[PDB]
């Protein structure tokens, strides 16, 4: 399963990193790649932005339709354990690296002195600069998203996307 111009048109360089349109009107994100002083994301004052954080997740929805060209698609609370996913890696140099993934559980990973919520999966690598790219999986005709990604090992076999659950 290959995802489609369209989707990947959802991954946005955003930060540190990256993050990922839900919506026309919904973004979602990892926390620490969020810009921090700022006065506006996208052209929009951030007092019009409804700015949701639980943890290392963030999901922004705006007053307007940013993206009136795409169609709503669901965003589940983690993603089913067992499961391959894809994360929909995006590199600076426009390079587009789909990694593949099985997913473990959501749990609380020790990470530089931090327990993080999140879920781990073994890649089946990831560098700084990609966190908040999208972990998602195809359900019958349509794509879904689960997490944005947030950590990986050194040898980068493990993998933690931040999840909204
Ligand atoms: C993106 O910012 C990034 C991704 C990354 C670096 C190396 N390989 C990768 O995939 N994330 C980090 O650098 C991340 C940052 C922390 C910040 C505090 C909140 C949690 C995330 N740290 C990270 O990956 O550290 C290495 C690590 C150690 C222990 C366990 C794990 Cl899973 C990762």
């Not at 955003?14 to 349109?21: C, E, H, R």
């Not at 307007?64 to 060209?69: A, L, V």
Request: proline share 6%.
């Amino acid at each position: 399963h290959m995802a489609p111009p369209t989707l990947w048109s959802r991954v946005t360089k955003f930060g540190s990193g990256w993050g990922f349109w839900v919506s026309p009107t919904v973004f979602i994100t990892t926390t620490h790649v969020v810009p921090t002083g700022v006065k506006e994301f996208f052209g929009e004052p951030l007092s019009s932005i409804a700015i949701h954080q639980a943890g290392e997740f963030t999901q922004f929805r705006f007053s307007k339709k940013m993206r009136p060209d795409l169609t709503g698609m669901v965003l589940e609370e983690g993603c089913p354990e067992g499961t391959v996913c894809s994360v929909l890696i995006k590199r600076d140099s426009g390079e587009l690296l789909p990694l593949a993934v099985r997913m473990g559980a959501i749990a609380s990973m020790r990470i530089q002195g931090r327990l993080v919520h999140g879920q781990s999966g073994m890649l089946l690598g990831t560098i700084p600069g990609d966190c908040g790219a999208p972990y998602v999986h195809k359900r019958g005709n349509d794509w879904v998203v689960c997490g944005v990604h947030a950590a990986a090992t050194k040898s980068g076999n493990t993998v933690v996307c931040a999840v909204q659950a």
